[PDB]
Amino acid sequence: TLKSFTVEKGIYQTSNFRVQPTESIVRFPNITNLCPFHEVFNATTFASVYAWNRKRISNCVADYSVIYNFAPFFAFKCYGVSPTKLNDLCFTNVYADSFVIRGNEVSQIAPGQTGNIADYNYKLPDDFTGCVIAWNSNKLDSKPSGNYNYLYRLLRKSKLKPFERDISTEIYQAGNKPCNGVAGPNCYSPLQSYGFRPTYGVGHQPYRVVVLSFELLHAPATVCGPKKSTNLVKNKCVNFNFNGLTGTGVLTESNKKFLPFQQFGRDIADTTDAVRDPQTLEILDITPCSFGGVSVITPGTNTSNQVAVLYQGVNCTEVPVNVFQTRAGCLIGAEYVNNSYECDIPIGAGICASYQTQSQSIIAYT
Amino acid sequence: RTQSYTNSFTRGVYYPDKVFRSSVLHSTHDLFLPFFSNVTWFHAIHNPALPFNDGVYFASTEKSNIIRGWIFGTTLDSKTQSLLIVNNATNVVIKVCEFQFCNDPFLDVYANNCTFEYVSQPFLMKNLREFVFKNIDGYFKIYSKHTPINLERDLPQGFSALEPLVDLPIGINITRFQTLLALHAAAYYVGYLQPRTFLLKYNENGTITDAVDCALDPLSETKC
Amino acid sequence: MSLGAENSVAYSNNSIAIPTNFTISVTTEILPVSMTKTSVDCTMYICGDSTECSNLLLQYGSFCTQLKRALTGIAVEQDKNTQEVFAQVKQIYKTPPIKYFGGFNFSQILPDPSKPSKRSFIEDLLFNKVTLADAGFIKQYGDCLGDIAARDLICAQKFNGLTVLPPLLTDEMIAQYTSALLAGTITSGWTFGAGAALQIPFAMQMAYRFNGIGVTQNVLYENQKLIANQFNSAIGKIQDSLSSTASALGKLQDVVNHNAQALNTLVKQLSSKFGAISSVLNDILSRLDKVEAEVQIDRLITGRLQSLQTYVTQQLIRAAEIRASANLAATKMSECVLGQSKRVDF
Amino acid sequence: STECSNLLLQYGSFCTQLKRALTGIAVEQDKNTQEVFAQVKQIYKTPPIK
Amino acid sequence: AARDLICAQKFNGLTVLPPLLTDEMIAQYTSALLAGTITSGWTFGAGAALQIPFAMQMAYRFNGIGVTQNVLYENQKLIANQFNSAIGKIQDSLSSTASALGKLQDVVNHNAQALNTLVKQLSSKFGAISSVLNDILSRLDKVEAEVQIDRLITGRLQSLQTYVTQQLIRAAEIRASANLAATKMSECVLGQSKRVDF
Ligand SMILES: *[C@@H]1O[C@H](CO)[C@@H](O)[C@H](O)[C@H]1NC(C)=O
Ligand SMILES: *[C@@H]1O[C@H](CO)[C@@H](O)[C@H](O)[C@H]1NC(C)=O
Ligand SMILES: *[C@@H]1O[C@H](CO)[C@@H](O)[C@H](O)[C@H]1NC(C)=O
Ligand SMILES: *[C@@H]1O[C@H](CO)[C@@H](O)[C@H](O)[C@H]1NC(C)=O
Ligand SMILES: *[C@@H]1O[C@H](CO)[C@@H](O)[C@H](O)[C@H]1NC(C)=O
Ligand SMILES: *[C@@H]1O[C@H](CO)[C@@H](O)[C@H](O)[C@H]1NC(C)=O
Ligand SMILES: *[C@@H]1O[C@H](CO)[C@@H](O)[C@H](O)[C@H]1NC(C)=O
Ligand SMILES: *[C@@H]1O[C@H](CO)[C@@H](O)[C@H](O)[C@H]1NC(C)=O
């Protein structure tokens, strides 16, 4: 830590000691059902874009690796979470949004996006956690004579808020004379068809889009990845895993009075202080394992290779590895004498260390 | 129905998150009812729909089951899906359909293609009941509290934080508001939410016991 | 605002004004000497026992080595300031068991041997007036382990790698140096500050001091009881002003308040995102794969490093100010206590 | 700019401590002028004879 | 005419505060110190002002420096003439030479230049596509403008950090000089000093 080979007389702050964890804890709620991703990705027909349907998924074990076997897609396009870590962590609800669009407007399904579908049919929020799966469906969603079972909306009087449906069919008016249910001058029908044909280009093919909207750990978790729970051990330095969040620390019994809608406790540095066990209704503190600073008291290397070690701010019972307890921690390797000399190496609150002849050894004194 | 105007008296503070904080001062920015606001008092002895202006604070100091249910929407006479909450002594039914609301919708003590239907535990249980309705990002959030009340003339003095009760993925357009009355004399307070910044105090037991505005008076800006 | 009372001195070319009596006045000057010595662990602050954050932090070179060097230099400089102010007398003098000094009562400034920490009455008033932050110079990990009431500010300070080191000289040693200086000043005079202590009666010492200011020494020998009574009344007034007024010691309380506020700001800075998706490092590591978590972790690392550098820079500036104040206090100990000063308003 | 203020809120309390440092300097300037010039207790006057 | 630098400083959030003591009160304090020194001597710095003729006060000042007081009483007219000529020479050197007051001018110039640099730092891109925030808002979508605005925010915060640190160091220097000026007021004006070259 000095980046040299010969050190001088003094006290040097070298490093920090920490207690390493011995075990590992995984705690997930006991759910046995399987999430029905198989019936979402296959259907005879999906819904139209203006009347997109949303399926709620909850209280089941979700395996996200079987989604690839259900549809031939490339773009597993995700924003706030990686596609490869969806089994290691858990949510409170999953919402699957199903519709069939044109291939040219797949890029409009993104947070902070505008256009026609993104403004008048299906709008995504700015803080969107969750992700999009889109695949080509020219085999099932096309006809040589044209496909007129899929509708979209041209324009609206105002923009459309995120996660909102408007299925009502009223004739638009852009003037003073009322339409009165007649599509005459300045009056148009709002919904018109894609009109799919197999002879269209690659940008005008039908695309099937499923949007999985994930809401994070603000509630008791219901949708969980496939992982095995472990027995809970307390008063030990472990590596816990409570509903997808990792960490290292010591779990103890808690006296905090959680309200029944609360399951997490947070400290002023926005770190987790208390947790609720997902299996049994139990509140546990999270206190980090033992740590501190280590100072090395030495004479010169041309005098001796003997050193003393000061563990700062801790008792000698707390340290894992002549022992004297000062007010600056406690000191191992130097004996305490009932004599008083002038200060040679300053240790702490009125204690100094020296290399004396009473064989030469390192002594500590007031 | 009879109208009166009264002061809010630092009511309408709710928990903004499901996170336990103890003995701390926390600053949040959300749709809150401002302190000492001008809320309105309705005596329904008799009725168009009330506006839903970026959230609604609702208060009722009566008893029994004379008050139940709400209607949210933007064109309640069909041709648009609307949100309906109906209460009883056992069950809460929450439905999002097109419906056929009349000019005076009410429930007798003695409807189209739709998706969302919900069955839940009763929302309802000297008894002042406070509700906060919010509609953010396609989610309808309902907070509530029940407290003992001494005088029924005005809203009480002090703080009573509103715990979060139901979050729903409704996803409709809500502009107007209607209250259902059970018919075999009911008075209620209505106020409107505004996007303000609050400074809240969590005591040693994790309960919000005090809160300060940030644009009421210059002393509140100084405390911010 | 009013600048002061309006006065019109009567000047004539043949008129003079000469005083006929005097007052003996005891005033109080308060000077800061040292401040809190702190040490910061970078790995526990920026990363918090995360391996990936430490591996990305190793690519930033030697920022944390030189921040640790600056904090160690400040901590050594504080003990140097205390040593140059207080540890100035060569020998530990003692007052005689007889307590007659010409009628001058030094009972409230001499130490009392009943208490273990042998401090005087005025020193006890000064210690009880300035409340302390109860910093990390007393060990608290056993107390931070036992979850009593709520989580403290000091426990959350030390859990994130911020530690307070104890000073080298305890308060007993500072009180012993003060008692040695007081005993030497009362018994010998100014002779102990320029060689060996030569004893002299206290009345003859005060006659020497009046001869230093231009007053003939028979004035003391004729008004000794009046001067001793005025000194005793002024000491009692100083005691009553310390017992009643608590705002006179605002400089040392300001030092304590600044040193606590900077550490509280350093702890509260850990909740910021700095453009990342989260402030919690484990949420970023669990939710995202390697490249994207590397980007977010780098953003958090840059923000925490900038905040820690800001803390170290303001600590260096405050250390320079405290060193200037300690040099002034050492000069005042040398020239007011160990001698008699002819400098006006010094 | 509202979006800039929303993105600036994620940087914590840098603005507060910059404001605190500048306020400390501003108070210190007045303290400097007070400790140099305001040393006399009363406002003395020179007589009209010169 | 054209836009001033002061308006450009004020339109970007930088404000100059007025001092608590106006120049009239500083001149009143200086006048009180001069009147007390001229009439009383050093007696007004230790309590109540005690009048004395100025010739006898100057004889006290001569006895302070080791010269016997009859020298002034025998050369009073010559001493008064030499003092009047020296005051007139101070008058002429202040009327002619303009470079004597360079320290206070440098104090003014540094504080002007720091604010001018802080205003001029607003035209930098810091790696973004534009220094204008509204052009970044109008020319990009949410994520790209968030990246560019984050770059501009870090650059402007770093420049303002540099300004505040320079101001703190200069404030320390000014406080040291003010402490020296207060000591010289208490010792040279309110008394006679025996310290050499002080
Ligand atoms: C799609 O899922 C259904 C389940 O409803 C299943 O019967 C069918 O075989 C699946 N088809 C393909 C091609 O995977
Ligand atoms: C999960 O474990 C708890 C604790 O024993 C138990 O009460 C609960 O019934 C379990 N749930 C299931 C679905 O097995
Ligand atoms: C820590 O050391 C102190 C001082 O010797 C002692 O009073 C205390 O009991 C110790 N803590 C333990 C042994 O847990
Ligand atoms: C609330 O608004 C009504 C509307 O006229 C007004 O009469 C009343 O004074 C207001 N209450 C206040 C300002 O407290
Ligand atoms: C939706 O609500 C908004 C209020 O924000 C209103 O302006 C608009 O007209 C509503 N749209 C419909 C179709 O009712
Ligand atoms: C917190 O709860 C305890 C329960 O014993 C109670 O004694 C204490 O007064 C409460 N604190 C409050 C109400 O501030
Ligand atoms: C001295 O003062 C008196 C009046 O105060 C004045 O008449 C006289 O001229 C003065 N002496 C001289 C030499 O001017
Ligand atoms: C000195 O003062 C103390 C308290 O101020 C008093 O108790 C004591 O009697 C005094 N000494 C003498 C000799 O009177």
Curated annotation (Swiss-Prot), chain A:
Region described as Immunodominant HLA epitope recognized by the CD8+: spans on this chain: 147-155
Result of changing Q192N: Reduced host ACE2-binding affinity in vitro
Outcome following mutation: T357A: Partial loss of O-glycosylation by host GALNT1
Effect of Q192R: In strain: Omicron/BA.1, Omicron/BA.2, Omicron/BA.2.12.1
Consequence of changing K143T: In strain: Omicron/BQ.1.1
Consequence recorded when altering N42Q: Reduced viral infectivity
Effect of A269D: In strain: Alpha/B.1.1.7
Record annotation: effect of changing Y152F: In strain: B.1.1.298
Region (Receptor-binding motif): 136-207
Record note on what altering L151R does: Increased resistance to neutralizing antibodies. Decreases HLA binding to NF9 epitope. Increased binding affinity to human ACE2
Lineage top rank: taxon: Viruses
Assembly notes: Binds to host ACE2. RBD also interacts with the N-linked glycan on 'Asn-90' of ACE2. Cleavage of S generates a polybasic C-terminal sequence on S1 that binds to host Neuropilin-1 (NRP1) and Neuropilin-2 (NRP2) receptors. Interacts with host integrin alpha-5/beta-1 (ITGA5:ITGB1) and with ACE2 in complex with integrin alpha-5/beta-1 (ITGA5:ITGB1). May interact via cytoplasmic c-terminus with M protein. May interact (via N-terminus) with host bilirubin and biliverdin, thereby preventing antibody binding to the SARS-CoV-2 spike NTD via an allosteric mechanism.
Protein name listed in UniProt: Spike protein S1
Gene this chain is encoded by: S
Location of this fragment in the whole protein: 302 to 696 of 1273
